[PDB]
């Protein structure tokens, strides 16, 4: 469908189709979810070690300059200087949104810097079924037209597909597909889940969201910690709650 995209403007992925009942697991995740907590903070200027306890899952969505190639951008210089390893649990996971440029390399440097190894590369494949004749300006270094973003998965220490197909968001909208949360939550990796650089629009049960653009906070380190005091400490997120 590549001689077709060059002809009609439809990206090869505009033609993938369909884009048993695993429903009970979803019920278990939902019953298990902590209430949402959130905290406005400027992450540049904030000691991350105050975020406690240590996290089972970190979802990290820094605002790359490339997200605003049409309309405070963080550089990979800035991202790399975060001390993620200070808030990661000894056995824990990271999901890092890397964009489609240097980030696919600088994001792997970050993963290694913080003590993870990449075991999954998740691709957000963006269709243009509603604007075929809208070819985008290219990175100077780009050979091809970039129609996807990558989200790198990292593990440290000891069902689904590695693709997300949705339609390209309207220019200036930076939201990532909410399906990233389903993939994450279906792994059953722990209940202490942190989204850095989330927004009001991303707040979600079972998640602690920290980000400079939040409008309200309800963070309390002690209240948050109580959700995981025994006998709730080592639950996966996908099990019956303890009576």
């Amino acid at each position: 469908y590549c001689q077709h995209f060059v002809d009609t403007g439809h990206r090869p992925q505009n033609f993938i189709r369909d884009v048993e009942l695993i429903r009970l697991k979803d019920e278990l995740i939902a019953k298990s979810n902590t209430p949402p907590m959130y905290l406005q903070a400027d992450i540049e200027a904030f000691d991350i070690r105050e975020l406690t306890p240590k996290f089972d899952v970190i979802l990290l969505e820094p605002p790359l300059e490339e997200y605003y190639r049409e309309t405070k951008c963080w550089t990979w210089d800035d991202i790399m200087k975060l001390e993620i390893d200070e808030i990661a649990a000894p056995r824990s996971f990271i999901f890092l949104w890397c964009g489609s440029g240097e980030g696919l390399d600088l994001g792997r440097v970050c993963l290694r810097k913080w003590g993870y190894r990449r075991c999954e590369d998740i691709c957000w494949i963006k269709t243009n079924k509603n604007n075929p004749g809208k070819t985008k300006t290219l990175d100077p270094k780009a050979v091809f037209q970039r129609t996807k973003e990558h989200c790198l998965m990292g593990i440290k220490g000891t069902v689904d597909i590695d693709l997300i197909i949705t339609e390209e968001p309207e220019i200036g909208n930076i939201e990532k597909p909410v399906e990233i949360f389903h993939i994450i939550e279906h792994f059953c990796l722990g209940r202490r889940r942190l989204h850095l650089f989330g927004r009001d629009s991303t707040i979600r049960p079972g998640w602690l969201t920290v980000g400079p653009t939040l409008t309200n906070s309800n963070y309390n380190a002690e209240t948050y910690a109580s959700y995981f005091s025994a006998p709730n400490s080592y639950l996966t997120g996908c099990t019956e709650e303890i009576e």
Binding site: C2, Q3, D18, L104, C119, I125, L138, V143, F144
Partner: protein
């Protein structure tokens, strides 16, 4: 010589300097993760750098090789400037490490030198195509590469029979003999291998 050429050999031991310069190198190496694999050192020491001065490298990577291939790519003198993914479907156009099921294959794109005269921006970094045979790369990449670099000299490493393509010299051990037609190349091959045996 537009028509397909190939050289059955061990790429570890063939002298690739005979082959000249190319505008595009493509390799689908057997990474060490059903056939003979090269260790990481054998891969780093491949003589990619003599193959190009100004041009592009297409490097299939899977698993652990997404990190090693980035290493070899930098070691050989390239900067990674794109990454193609092939979404694998069936004849009904639906989708088909140990943590997720892999519905794609990755191809790093690297640049070297100052390649000039290339129509960059004509294709997507997503290929969609039916999975032909197990461990077969999809024909659409050749078209993509042809649109990028029309009529230039190209070389594939670790090709299999069906990989032979016009404007392409394929190297690989599952090939049949030595089919060479470009006069400058049949010349350097006879000067470097008088008795025709690597």
């Amino acid at each position: 010589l537009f028509p397909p050429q190939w050289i059955c050999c061990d790429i570890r031991y063939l002298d690739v300097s005979i082959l000249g310069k190319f505008a595009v190198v493509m390799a689908d190496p057997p990474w060490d993760i059903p056939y003979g694999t090269l260790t990481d050192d054998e891969m780093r020491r491949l003589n990619i750098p003599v193959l190009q001065d100004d041009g592009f490298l297409f490097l299939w990577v899977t698993g652990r090789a997404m990190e090693l291939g980035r290493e070899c790519l930098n070691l050989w003198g390239y900067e990674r400037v794109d990454e193609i993914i092939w979404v694998k479907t069936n004849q009904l156009q639906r989708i088909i490490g140990h943590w997720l099921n892999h519905g794609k294959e990755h191809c790093l794109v690297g640049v070297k030198g100052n390649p000039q005269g290339f129509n960059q921006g004509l294709d997507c970094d997503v290929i969609v195509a039916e999975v032909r045979s197990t461990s077969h790369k999809p024909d659409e990449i050749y078209g993509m590469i042809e649109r990028l670099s029309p009529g230039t000299r190209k070389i594939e490493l670790f090709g299999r029979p069906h990989n032979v393509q016009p404007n392409w010299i394929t190297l690989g051990n599952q090939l049949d003999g030595i089919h060479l037609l470009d006069p400058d190349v049949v010349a350097r091959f006879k000067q470097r291998y008088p008795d025709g045996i690597i």
